Amino acid sequence: MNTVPFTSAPIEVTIGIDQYSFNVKENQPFHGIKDIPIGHVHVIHFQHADNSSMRYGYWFDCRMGNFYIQYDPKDGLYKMMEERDGAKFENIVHNFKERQMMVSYPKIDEDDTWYNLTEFVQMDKIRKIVRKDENQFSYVDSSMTTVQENELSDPAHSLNYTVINFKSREAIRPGHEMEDFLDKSYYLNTVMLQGIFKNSSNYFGELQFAFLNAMFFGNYGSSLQWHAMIELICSSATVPKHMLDKLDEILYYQIKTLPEQYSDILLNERVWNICLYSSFQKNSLHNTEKIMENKYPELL
Template sequence: MSRPPKTTIALDIPAGWLVGIDLYYFTSTPTFKGIKSIPPGRTHILHWGQDETSVRNGVVFEAKEGEVLIFKWDSKKEEMLTNQTIDIAEALSIVPEQYPYMLAFDTISEEHHTAESADFATLTNHVTQSVVSSVIAPDVVVSSTTATAQEAGVLKGALQKSKEQRDKRHASPVAESDVSSSTKKDASHDIPADEMNNITPGFENLDKEPTLNFPALTPDHTWRPGSTGRERTLDSLDSSWYIENVLLKDSSSSSLLGYLQLSFLLCLVLSNYSSSITWRDYIKILCKGEELSSKNPDLYVQFFDILVHQLTVAPAEYLDGLLELSALMEPLGNLKEIIFEGQRGFNNEEDAVNPRLKRGFDKLEGELEKMGYKLQKPEED
């Protein structure tokens, strides 16, 4: 069959569910079969959940000409089947009969338009397919509970340590030949079944769970390897070396901003807490970029603009909920001091205040003040 124009999403989902694309939300009907005519060339997020209180799931994708994405809810497994888990040929064969019952993207945007939804393109202007594919594998469904690879690694390490401790605790100091089979059998009754199998309850499928592969961030450890004394202190106060030589080593400023935007998007749409941590970590690191803000003001002007747009669309309950905005008042206060007072003299002579940075930060601070937030001065060491 010839494929429909633009991007088409065939979505087989129960009626009455809360479905959305980008920042548009609507309730599925018995006749709803998907979304059609999604303009190519932009990043979108398709998301769904049983209602407003349930765990939300979603897929981030780039719309392409002639692209057909298939999603089918499996009620027995209680999971969404995607292009990689269903028979594509069979699914495509029924698209023509479903097509008339799909909602056009333009229709959705007109009928469910809000002030916030209009900002979606600006919220994702750095979220390229390259950024998305480096964080999320193709067709992988992300949910409110999906962890970052960094968090999953910490958890796996803790579980491995727990396993080793259990093994050590249950290891018998007595030689195997000295213990009768009946004694071993009786002793095994004292060991929980999960410990006998070296499996921690609730984490049997941990390795199979998808993760968000954002770059690993260490906002409290921004010094260069092997540094000591004064050099480590300077790198702790000024994250410029870390940003340039770690975060931008195999990436670009635009990609860095793309990760910042993607982490916010997953937090905003899916209520993904792990992404909110990543979002805050990026902000904390950028807020210490003293030398970099002078060398690359364009990056920081864009950074301020992104934050303003993000704060504009964030629900009020998210500010000190998922986003934990209060925790950023001191880092942002530190950045204000850098911009308005110039370099502190640790690495360079003092620089004059950059007017573009000043205007951008003034706008950001004004937005924060409208929301009732006040920047804090950094604590003196």
């Protein structure tokens, strides 16, 4: 198990870590989160109690380094940093544990939720979507725009998701206009899976990452990406059977985890009705359809 120590908590803030949320009061004696499960990416995120504008946070993997949080009073936010001196870090963490100033990550043992939301997410792929190569962790916030959003303005602070656009020359083979617009299989399997992502696992990793940035930061461009990647599969008549079964599992856990009170902004009515009821794969998402119908029948 691993630890993200905090130098201090000078400002009141809600801290979340993966799907969990908790409160820290102004100058409360808080010195981090411990017992973080090894083997998964994680995200630590923040919403200041005095300005909920800008949720922000850091994707990281404790196998890749020793990371801690320190508030910066000039830039006004909790910043992640790497500690390169490993003896110093263990010593710091051991002392904060002995003083029991660290909150305990509440991983119930029956629970596979986080695994199921991050199965295909790999820190190395996150670091290509979020370019900031001098760090091993990745910063994301509410307002960051995507490469595709900037085409339609700072590029250094962008989310470089794979651009999907159903009315583009990349999506449509000359001479197969009607075929390719109504059945996206060429675009899914040849352009995206074989050409760009190389395999279904990298495709699913980006899809899951996009969902999680939408949910945790309200990042609208990430929500657009998540829905686009779903619709591309559902709108393809030819999809490997293993991808369809996995997609159903992926979406099921995403819908299960979504805050009920956020369904109105994070779920696109048109895409979901199309995917569940009109698309080629309308009959291939049994678990996702069952949870959607019992949890959000209003949308449908």
